[PDB]
Design a protein around this ligand. Structure first.
Ligand SMILES: Nc1nc(=O)c2c(ccn2CCCCc2ccc(C(=O)N[C@H](CCC(=O)N[C@@H](CCC(=O)N[C@H](CCC(=O)O)C(=O)O)C(=O)O)C(=O)O)c(F)c2)[nH]1
Ligand SMILES: Nc1nc(=O)c2c(ccn2CCCCc2ccc(C(=O)N[C@H](CCC(=O)N[C@@H](CCC(=O)N[C@H](CCC(=O)O)C(=O)O)C(=O)O)C(=O)O)c(F)c2)[nH]1
Lengths: 450, 454, 450, 454
């Protein structure tokens, strides 16, 4: 045993399940909002020898040693972050977060004291749990256990941010930080609006560029670097490895400076994390060079044009859509007026198009909508003529659930309907086969084999 | 643009630094204790297409969909983790989603302890990690010390072993809710049954950190903490020779007439998700499961027994050169040389051997901001098929390297001037070039796990 | 030296200032809302030998010994509390709080965990600080430091409790306890209203009977013992010594019981306090027997009739009045439409009628109204014909401040106006003399001498 | 109804119990340490018309109005407090609004410490109060332990003195923000300069509790803590022979070129109001100021020297009867008899002497839920013009009373049965009646401060 044997011959049991997943990602049209298909160039760096380097430290201030190469890869991800997200090196960025969720908790540990107060878009309102979600029976997110805070909702019959129930709940809550983060929100954030709301309440505003990372970088969608520190994930829209970073402003705000400088750096290490995943830091810096290319500018223009083409086709098929339309990479289809809901995701799962339940902007265990994300298959060189091609397959998939829902009542029986009916089982097996035949016809980033 | 281009031509600027570090890992003698060289089989799965699967959920309990195949790597990683440390699945459970060892430690705190509850951990300048609860005398630095109150338990400064007396004493005076038997820089073994008797007298949860001894415990090479602890956290890398991730081992099953249950299973699983993390790094989950099956093989046992034999040969050789080792010696994978009797501190050595391409780290010796010792790690080069005869050759290179720094200390005074002395002195740099190149010729001659090119 | 010498001969320096205060309390018409004049029978028990008894314990569960007499005085205050505030001994009461503020913090330590959440009427909205008041620069009340919580406001152009901004801010805050407490609020609390709001939000509702203690006891004003635990002070309206108590429901709410039982008893001791002020517990129990008398029923009917007579006379004099009128013991005069404000209290201070600034229901350092309390001089056998007699003296006092305000700008100069003008100094010296001559003509509870 | 009726005719039901307790205070030998008999001059001011003055504010900084005269009692109470303990007003300040000693202690915590900061205090079963931070091994009971984290510092169990070694040790391991030199049941004196060296090595605020030694310090009878402490809290009653209130003493004035200031003045004043309290109990503020001027007189010095002489005569007499005293003896106002060598616990004695009209309290002796000793207090009867010859007569009555309980223990077993034995046994009750009545004849013969009638 040497340690350089092939995965196919060292452990064929895992090689089995590795390329069975590569099959399913090519066999199916992944329309999950948070999902993307990383490039081979970044996937090669993700599984590189940089995993064998413990670099607990910082540029010039490392507690270890021998981090010669890792230092310049360290700063290059920073330089590429300042170049993919313009502005004078006036701005600083930290690239050590293990993912997007640790990036949000890090900024809280950096700027907020324990049990300090936050404002955040509720998870059933277009956010993730990192934004501060307590349930009415239990505290769910650690951002809600270590920091007390209250949800920030949007207009339930308009789909845009409710700035009336915002300044109201703000003056009555006086938090130290609010979040303008998006997980399921189809339009644009008014940055200048909430910035002065944050000084009326004396709060810092933080967003999540998780679903718009590449949209802001290619100047296709507006950026916060004149109206906001704000954190983001590496993947989803930037088409990279699983990591995260935190964008903080540096310099003056003698004049008063900006305090968002070394406390964020101190929060990710040595406060919350330890060894930087240097293989991920380099993998994403390859995708950070991807973000400075003209192809990425055209790819990003493709994802919005495709998200609007997906919407306009979804619009004509008889679907109501919260928000009114779309101005991002995502769709928030409202299926309740069409007799469908979010949970009855299982039907399209056995057809091999992966979606997710989404909180209905205004309903009452069963959600009422679902969330589709364009950039996943748009990375497969999809087009708008192929983006109304998707819609007929979603329209066909809805009709299978719409008919079995009329033949049942329970949903423990609705999902068992697709298993024992042996007639809908004929209809699903045939439906996925053409979805598999269609999905396999487009290129797929990454390795041909794994 | 297709997305399947080679890294060498898509970004030659990173291909530049990718094999320049692969050179430096072959170019240098990595003596860091926490560092290892992962296997090629795991690196292929680590940078696989499993990064393109968002599986926010749990095996069979996922809020998303299409998780048919991606689930099976999780449950197989579960079974392989319970098999690498010989735990029958009806008595023990394991969670394989922690992104690393630090999120794994904080997850157990959020799972069993309430905010501002009390923790006890070996102090960092005494052999512990930051996740164990380390405050400075001016500031709380680690998040385990901000969200949870904590107090250190130090060692006997003239014994080098964990003072298990000043632990049970101050525990009765502190009433903590969880104690850690976790080690980052300590050359001997933790008396787990001892810490078991302290943890049930005060009613506290006992957690260990197999971070530096995971594979030593996996090969049954050293006594295990899975019989004297309720929780056990570990890293997937370090001694286990895997990807950078973490695990959490919790006991399941049975613990008036009615029986006491076990509460850790569903509280730990809730802490890692949806409380603290989000998308599970499945590319790492599969990579560490690949190193988990290798870890159940007789080859991994032989490797782990070699790590001990090499760590003791490195220690016994350093002893004869006139060096001091706290605790007296070693029974694990690491050495903790005390450089104070040799007229040199921890930091100034760490710079000398760094520019010679022997990677060490400063370590604080019981006594005194600038340390006086270093931490040497066997499992890094033991994975390079090193032997004891090749591990006393390393020691002579360290002994020769110390004398280079020991002489510049006589020619300088400060340490802002000590580090620029080793750069411009065309005579000590000439002596450095011979030692650095000769270590390179020695280090480059050994095999290296992973891709030769990547 | 024996220890039984008279205060007049042992320390004449303090006897001087003791009977100079008894002069000023008789020489002036105390119209402070929180103020009352205690009876001699209770004042005698307040300075009794019960100060020399350390009774750290509880009925039958005392850690000390020899508390034979103090036990029956202990329970008698309880029995008199259950008799002055009817209902089956279904209800329990704790009589150890040192005052009213420690009573509120005790119920929080009893039912709430540290940093749990509260809802409370803001201090500038009719509450005290015990209700949870944070300033926009500093946390002021300890109820706001040990428990995070947010204010509960009222309708700013109606004066009644804003139940729209109540259920709104409630669902978005999900606290464990809300307060319905009054310090400056002229009307009645809808108890049944907020009780079900407290179960929609899953919160306990606590009030402060501080300004209505005797009004609820004589059945003149509605009680909470069917729609609420709720704490109160001993004095203000009950005309007793300075202490406090906490009223908690006992028994069932097998059936689920009420948890408000031994945790309140544990919070006042041994958690927050120590030695019970037994001299105060007995002094107030004398005033608790006062609350079961027909005279107290007629006295309480006098305070409301006088508060409405004071209002109706204040109404006709050209004063606007928030809330619309009055249904309690208090007045919340709105002086801004009359060119006066709250701060310009100094004028009537040198005239010897003591008032206090009150937060204007809707203004912008200088408040805009003041708070008068009827039960203070109503204890001096005042009448309604004597309660419009007050109004002309308040009307005259306003006109002194209204004219000097036109002759100055600053208020550091407005208060120095009444010192150096030597013409308004003639007008104030003459004004207080007839106020002193009028106030001295009525009986005064307590000792003739001290 | 006028409001000026006599208590005897307005409520004869309370006049019933008012002089029935005044009887019982003359009827019995009050041996409680914390208890004293307040002066008539203070009782007149305590139940004065100053209860009818709401003065939410501070001398010169009141948010209300008409506080002309009521202010002057405050500032005079300030001056008299600084004069009773010899503190020049430019170096020390005092706050006179705390309702008692417990709100005074928590006020200093809210003033200088943040929530969940750390406190150190002598454990309650070791000689401390609850305000010092006492948690049980199952529950946090005192509010000082819920809002602030804390840990006890115990005593040497075979010395009876405060272990100042296991204090500076565990302090370096605990990094507290404030330590207390406060005592509730400890017969010797606290080494303040010792606790001063521990409190500045860890940078912590040193606070004392003169609760049991306020008047002993006021008469300069025992060494004072006003030279080795930044804060000092005290009760107005107990040894100071005043009304039930509290005080807080903080240092003011001066503590690179620039000088260090003192931060306690405006932080302490803000904690007592408007943070924690509301209306100042001015009737108590004036009452304690009356006892504060008496405390600066040679009569109060003679009384305080007598409290020591009587406490030592009580101790030396108990020693000869075959009783044990922890610490060895006494140098303050209290005795801590250890009843375990006499075959009897703390609780069962406390019942016997209670029904004989000698008031004691159970006290836990270093060793073991049901104590084994009691706490005897001199200043209660020393205020009744007691002498040492009259304080060994008390001891013989305690010695005789113990033998009554020592024999019933041989005739019963439980303590639910021990307390009903002393009630229905027409033979031990006959022996109790002689001892109780003869203590009554002795106790009734001494003067009593306060009203004879009230
Ligand atoms: N066994 C063990 N366990 C582990 O876990 C471990 C290993 C190996 C790796 N690992 C895991 C990774 C270990 C990570 C780690 C460790 C310790 C500290 C720490 O705490 N050091 C302080 C000094 C740190 C300190 O003063 N920080 C100041 C900065 C002040 C400054 O920069 N300059 C001032 C200027 C003042 C003037 O103007 O005069 C000066 O001159 O001092 C602050 O934060 O404020 C100390 O050594 O005590 C740490 F942070 C981060 N082995
Ligand atoms: N030097 C000193 N300092 C002072 O400050 C001081 C003095 C003199 C006066 N002062 C100031 C006043 C002192 C105030 C003070 C003191 C101690 C405790 C305390 O903490 N005691 C616990 C037992 C207390 C305890 O178990 N409480 C249970 C109740 C459980 C129960 O009632 N029954 C169960 C049934 C179980 C079954 O069904 O089996 C049983 O049987 O045990 C709880 O709270 O849950 C102990 O002694 O350790 C205290 F609370 C309150 N002298």
């Amino acid at each position: 045993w040497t340690g350089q044997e092939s995965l196919s011959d060292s452990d064929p049991e895992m090689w089995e399940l590795l390329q069975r997943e590569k099959d399913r990602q090519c066999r199916g049209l992944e329309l999950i909002a948070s999902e993307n298909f990383c490039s081979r160039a970044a996937l090669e760096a993700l599984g590189s020898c940089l995993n064998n380097k413990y670099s607990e430290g910082y540029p010039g201030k490392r507690y270890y040693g021998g981090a010669e190469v890792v230092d310049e890869i360290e700063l290059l991800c920073q330089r590429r972050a300042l170049e993919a997200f313009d502005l004078d090196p006036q701005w600083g960025v930290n690239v050590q977060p293990y993912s997007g969720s640790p990036a949000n908790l890090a900024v809280y540990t950096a700027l907020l004291q324990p049990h300090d107060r936050i404002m955040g878009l509720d998870l059933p309102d277009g956010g993730h749990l990192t934004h501060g979600y307590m349930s009415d029976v239990k505290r769910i997110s650690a951002t809600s256990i270590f920091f007390e805070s209250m949800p920030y909702k949007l207009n339930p019959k308009t789909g845009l941010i409710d700035y009336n129930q915002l300044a109201l709940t703000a003056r009555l809550f006086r938090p130290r930080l609010i979040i303008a983060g998006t997980s399921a929100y189809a339009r644009l954030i008014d940055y200048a609006r909430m910035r002065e709301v944050c000084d009326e309440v004396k709060a810092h505003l933080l967003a999540d560029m998780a679903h718009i990372s590449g949209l802001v970088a290619a100047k296709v969608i507006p950026s916060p670097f004149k109206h906001a520190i704000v954190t983001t994930t590496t993947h989803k829209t930037l088409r990279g490895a699983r990591s995260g970073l935190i964008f903080y402003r540096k310099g003056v705000k003698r004049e008063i400076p900006y305090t968002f400088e070394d406390r964020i750096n101190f929060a990710v290490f040595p406060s919350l994390q330890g060894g930087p995943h240097n293989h991920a830091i380099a993998a994403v810096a390859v995708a950070l060079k991807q973000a400075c290319t003209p192809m990425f500018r055209e790819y990003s223009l493709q994802v919005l044009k495709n998200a609007r083409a997906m919407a306009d086709a979804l619009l004509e098929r008889g679907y109501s859509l919260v928000s009114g339309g779309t101005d991002n990479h995502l769709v928030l289809v409202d299926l309740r007026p069409k007799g469908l809901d979010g949970a009855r995701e299982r039907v399209l799962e056995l057809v091999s198009i992966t979606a997710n339940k989404n909180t209905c902007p205004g309903d009452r265990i069963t959600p009422g909508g679902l969330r589709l994300g364009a950039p996943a298959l748009t990375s497969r060189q999809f087009r708008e003529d192929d983006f109304r091609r998707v819609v007929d397959f979603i329209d066909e998939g809805v009709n299978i659930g719409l008919e079995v829902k009329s033949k049942t009542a329970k949903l423990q029986d609705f999902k068992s309907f697709l298993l024992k009916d042996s007639e809908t089982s004929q209809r699903l097996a045939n439906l996925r086969q053409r979805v598999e035949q269609f999905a396999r016809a487009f290129p797929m980033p990454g390795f041909d084999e794994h």
